[PDB]
Amino acid sequence: EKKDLIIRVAGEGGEGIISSGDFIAAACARAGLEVYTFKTFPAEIKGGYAMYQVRASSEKLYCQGDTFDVFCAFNGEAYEQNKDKIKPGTAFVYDYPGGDFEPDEIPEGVFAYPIPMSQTAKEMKSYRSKNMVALGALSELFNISENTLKEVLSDKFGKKGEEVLAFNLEAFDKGKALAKALTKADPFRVADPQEPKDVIIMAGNDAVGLGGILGGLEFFSAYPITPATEVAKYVATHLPKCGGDLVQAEDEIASIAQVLGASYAGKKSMTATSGPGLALMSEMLGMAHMSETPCLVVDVQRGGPSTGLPTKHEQSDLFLAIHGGHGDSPRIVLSVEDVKDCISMTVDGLNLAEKYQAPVIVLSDGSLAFSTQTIPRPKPEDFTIINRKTWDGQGTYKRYELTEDNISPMAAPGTPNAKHIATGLEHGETGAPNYSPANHELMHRKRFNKQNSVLDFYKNMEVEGVEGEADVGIITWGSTIGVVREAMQRLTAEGLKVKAMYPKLLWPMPVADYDAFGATCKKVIVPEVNFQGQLSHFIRAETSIKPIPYTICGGLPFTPEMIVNRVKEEIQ
Amino acid sequence: EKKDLIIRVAGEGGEGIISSGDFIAAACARAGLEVYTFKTFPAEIKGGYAMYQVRASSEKLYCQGDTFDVFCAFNGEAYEQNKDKIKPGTAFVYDYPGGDFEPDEIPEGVFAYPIPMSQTAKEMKSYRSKNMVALGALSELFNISENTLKEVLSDKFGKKGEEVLAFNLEAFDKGKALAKALTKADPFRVADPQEPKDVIIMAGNDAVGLGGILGGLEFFSAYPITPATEVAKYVATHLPKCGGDLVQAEDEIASIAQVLGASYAGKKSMTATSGPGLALMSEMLGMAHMSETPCLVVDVQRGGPSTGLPTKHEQSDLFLAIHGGHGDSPRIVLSVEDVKDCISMTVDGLNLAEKYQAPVIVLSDGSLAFSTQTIPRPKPEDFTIINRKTWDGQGTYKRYELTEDNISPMAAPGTPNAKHIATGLEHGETGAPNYSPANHELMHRKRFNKQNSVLDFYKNMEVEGVEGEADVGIITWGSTIGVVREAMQRLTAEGLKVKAMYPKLLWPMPVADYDAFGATCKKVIVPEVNFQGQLSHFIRAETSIKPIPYTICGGLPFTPEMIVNRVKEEIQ
Amino acid sequence: TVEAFHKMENMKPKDYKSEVPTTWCPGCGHFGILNGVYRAMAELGIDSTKFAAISGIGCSSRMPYFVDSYKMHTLHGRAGAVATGTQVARPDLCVVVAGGDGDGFSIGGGHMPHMARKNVNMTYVLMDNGIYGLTKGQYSPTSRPEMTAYTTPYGGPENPMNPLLYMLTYGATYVAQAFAGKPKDCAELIKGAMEHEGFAYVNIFSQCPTFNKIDTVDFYRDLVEPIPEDHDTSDLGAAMELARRPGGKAPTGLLYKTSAPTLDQNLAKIRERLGGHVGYDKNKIIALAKP
Amino acid sequence: TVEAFHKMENMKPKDYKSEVPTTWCPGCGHFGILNGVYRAMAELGIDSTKFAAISGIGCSSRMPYFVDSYKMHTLHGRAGAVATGTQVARPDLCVVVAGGDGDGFSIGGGHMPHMARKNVNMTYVLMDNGIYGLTKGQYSPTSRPEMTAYTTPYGGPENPMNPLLYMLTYGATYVAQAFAGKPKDCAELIKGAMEHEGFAYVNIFSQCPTFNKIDTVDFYRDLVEPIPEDHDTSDLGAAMELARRPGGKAPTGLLYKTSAPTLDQNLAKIRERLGGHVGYDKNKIIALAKP
């Protein structure tokens, strides 16, 4: 039984394409439904074709889905951009008559629903209310709660006066009436309303900023870069409320430099960037490793290489995150799946930087950055918070004291009797420069054993599927995890012998857990969106698995059917 | 039969430790001998313990050797620094009487030869001539040709006047007389002179600079960093003679930016740096890959991570050289073994950047940088030169034209009818920004297939040893190749079933050639000076070889006996 | 000696337009600067085959796409350092950098002093809109503190810098300022910058109506003040006084122009004192390494 | 607001020395600057638990190792940016950056404008020896063109920059210069720089006898000229005249001092206008995301 509905709305940005999608998402959440959205702004700032896709369901949602069930075109350009996906079985709502285009032969089997959105909006002497007419029609045709939709519109337009709101509700009613006059022949309906859940709706980048704040963030420095700037925007607004400071630095080098200085001063500090910025930070992340100074970098991955494809989907910064430092210079690397992770794994990221006095990189991506989801409302008291090991004041303080757990107690400036230097030169226990062979061997083992002990403490590699032997195991990372989750639902509903594993700690990697998983699968497929198969590379280098890479690199995420089809090709 | 002699001279830098070693090296080369030197400057610029080690032989030399046969201490600190290596069987020359120390119990079996170097120089009213006295004694005691030694001194001090020269020759003769008065009990003598060969003596960094010039270098930009600055010093002196320009930029980002700008203008361009600088260059090397702009970076590797150990030995930048770019951003990576390679592989590096319009990184190291060798005199006409593919002027010019060999003809600004854009954005054939899925997939394949086709053209992975199946195979890279070469001489002289392979193309790697080698070995050992076993990582990731890493990371190179002992542990 | 000038006869501004449609917002000030660029190139009779436009990232930085010439679109903040290499490698070319206030003085701010100090023979057209346009509205080193923007929702916690004063202090040998609303003023100052032998800097106010709501056309029109004709453009001290805005008014016109050796000229002097030439016998260099 | 001053009784310069032997060359000017730092700290009665010395890479940058306090040895050119993060995180600390001419104005040249413009409450002691000492003798942005060095064996192909003029142009609110040969001048100017609330910059000539053979002690002694007592340290234009060296003489003394809000003060104003504090109910932020 189909529990979800995927509605794509597209047209001229500025006619309310995005705002319409956000209204539907909020209305469905207020009606007790789960929501997953995605959008593309116009390619140029001045405007042009925009797209919003909202998926709503009575059950949990983990990705955008294969393709839309319903498409709503505000103009001809939107129809042309999506014509190839208007296939038999889909429902097609479009601005007609009185729009700017005559639709070609609507394919047989397509449920077509012309709605005169532009003409109705013009007869009311308010062309900008066109999206309200569309919303009314979509609500009527596909059972988007009229009650919560008008609640959402009331919250937005009530502050503008009783006339403005009653006008937009009137345009909504006109669209509802236009749709009611058509005969509904398609099988698509949004799930019936339920009791509203204790949820919020958040975008990926906002959720990263909130996770930092909830993790005890005190200092943030960043430089704007697509698709990461909304993290700094959120932090700039809300961190000062909690007693913290955001600074916009002059570039990414200055930003990570300020993070290290604030961290040395004793404050939990982080930055956010994308691929180009992470590459500029490579030298300073070496200093963080060598001096054992906590820091957190969130890399919202975008299309590369070089300037690349800033607005497209790609997870191709794994090589740089792990191997981007000169010398033997390891980082702790995490990667998020969904909006929930953007909160809790940014908390994880700060906690692990504190606990292991090391640079941590959290890999997100540009689709998740702008996707919104219903997620359970975060409760601040439910997050475990870890603070850097601090000196108890007993004995003599040595910044790099050799301990059993390889973690040297820290001391913020101002601590009596703990004056010390943090340094990027190789050094002995007191931080004095030391170039002797035995010390370099000894301190490499200290810092490597320290960071590698994350494996004994942080486990985040969920396994699902059949319990026994599997014909195919699937390993993936990043937001591709969510796509494989939906594919696994379909594969196990077909009775296929499949299992899946979802590493979210990417480096150091839990080799034994990899080997235990692979030993139970006849074959292991690794789907990821990068050209070289970057996770597969590390699986080959570090485990006894030789995976079958399934790589794509066209600026788009995987869809569930692609995973399903690839898996079935490997089952005999 | 012992063909070589290893003489270590050590003491206060500023008393002519380095110049003394260079005089010995030049004299032995003038006498038809092969020479391999190494040195360490004082740890601080103000001065302190300096060391020079010269190895001379009637046969080819490939590394510094296990340890010295003869040690000459100019002061007590030099004796203490080397006390543990003054073992029975070795010869020991020291400043006595009149020195600054009382020697400890010289172990029985050590052939000790006291020479009053300091006092003799004082009697002549020129303490700075102390090293001349030492040279006379060493020449007499250990058969360093007096004839060629005085030639070398005459070439140096003849320009200062016959009085200055005759003064230094008298100090030399005084040292010769002091040593003749002792009875020689040790078996050590430098090989008797041979027909002088048509050779030069060059340090590694100077050889890189010369290799650049011989490869057609036209533009060099660098920022000083240890241990790479001597490259820029050599280029600055000699490149303007050939019509080229050196510029010192304000930092490494500016330097690689200027290299790319000059290369875009049509000039063969390069820089030199070390680990910290290569990390700063990561973003701009992405631009070189994406825009298909030739550039060459020589990374004279030093101790890392971070500031690390600037003056010590380490080959730990392989991870950064291969994986340092964001996105899927490959580089062509070579690494040199010896001074000969520093010349020819810098030519190779410039040639490959021209042919494949791609960033090339050549990895050297801080020991090779200051080591000198006798090498056959280079003749400019013996180097094959490759130039970038240029447009034939027919049709319409497209900077990124899709060709069968994936290499697009280039055109320098000023070329009629070839106005175009070079760009870091993903792009189509004309360089216009293009974010479509099919184009990204297509252009990734263009640039990757292009750079991977180096494997069909450049082969530099010598194999030596037994022809049949071997009990142990050795794979190594960098100057460690030279250490393993000498180890192979010893192992194959004992009739042991060993073979060795010396990759000098590090990325992309010739997997089939790796697999064919490994199929003929029961075991494969990979010695390298880094903590993680970086080459072993790529062997595991890309080949079917399961290597045994032999990693050291103490700022020192391997010695041949270390390789010999490890190999024997793996056979029996 | 630039060989791009006065090679074409009877050229019109439209002859330097490329086929690429202009994608800037309506009312964006960058249009006026683009028009000035077209007029300068036509008035110089430039053969744009010998013209190299280099830009980084930003709305401003897209301008070379609309100009018919050779061009490189490189990395954010690095256009001027890249252009130094192009210029030194090929001093016959006319080398021009275009970019915005963030590209030039935020991430690019470390390269600015050395281009000017070394007197590289290039033109730098900085399109100052007081904001980061392309990344959708964060404040810049020229933003006024009362402005609110997307990383500064509570105002800017610092004062802005003075681009003209920076460039004068850095040693730029041609320093001018204009407003994009006067495209003929832009064309004359840009034309003079291209012909000048040395580092020539033109700061041009350009409105960003989409994100910068306080540095509007009316604000810039009221802000500017033409430089009096009796101003001595060889007096560095007087130029710096002008750059500091007497009465709070931003000067427009040519502030400073002086003749000094350029970087490529000094590099050539080095080669000349060595008798350097491409055919030099490399065996002479090798021979120095004989034992 | 720095809380390190006047907290300790009977402090002597040796109380701020670490155990690390100072291994600079004999006759290196850096010794005079280091002695000035010790003397300033003792005259201020500084509690060095509340004192942070931060440096990059260079002979000059070794200074924090020799100081008994909190300290960081960071990356070449990044000390001032690191120190900004330290200072903003902990405005109670006395934050001092020390470094050379290359560390500061070559690789670090891009961070210099923004520290000064934002008036970060810190002290920057630049030890100007006209060369790169630690990397063994390459020329610097302050080297004279007639000098030959190891990458410029045929002279420097450009003019040097003016550190004092840069920093005045950038907006430093305390600007001073001294010669390392006058350790009491160094001590008074560094002490005033520490006490100053805002970005304080002290340029100190320092001989490098090992590699710089022309910028000698005698050269610097003849170059400097004390600032007249009637000079107005609130007059920015007059301070800039001094920085440009009338008669070719480098001024020594205090050029400029002014009172303006610091970066940490403006950041604090933002929090105060929001009622921000560490105990803020984060549920209020979360509630904004409810559908």
Ligand SMILES: Cc1ncc(C[n+]2csc(CCOP(=O)(O)OP(=O)(O)O)c2C)c(N)n1
């Ligand atoms: C290394 C790096 N960091 C950040 C960015 C993001 N970025 C692109 S343009 C830009 C600033 C645009 O401002 P400006 O230079 O003033 O030009 P404008 O758009 O205002 O004309 C930024 C921060 C980037 N492309 N690369």
Ligand SMILES: Cc1ncc(C[n+]2csc(CCOP(=O)(O)OP(=O)(O)O)c2C)c(N)n1
């Ligand atoms: C990224 C990087 N590039 C280059 C270097 C090499 N380096 C160390 S110190 C230094 C310059 C020293 O000159 P200066 O700052 O004037 O200090 P001084 O030794 O003269 O006191 C350089 C170029 C480095 N350590 N890191």
Ligand code: SF4
């Ligand atoms: S965002 Fe601003 S600068 Fe960019 S095109 Fe639009 S108006 Fe111009």
Ligand code: SF4
């Ligand atoms: S090299 Fe120069 S700056 Fe460095 S310690 Fe010696 S004299 Fe001082």
Ligand SMILES: [Mg+2]
């Ligand atoms: Mg701007």
Ligand SMILES: [Mg+2]
């Ligand atoms: Mg210096």
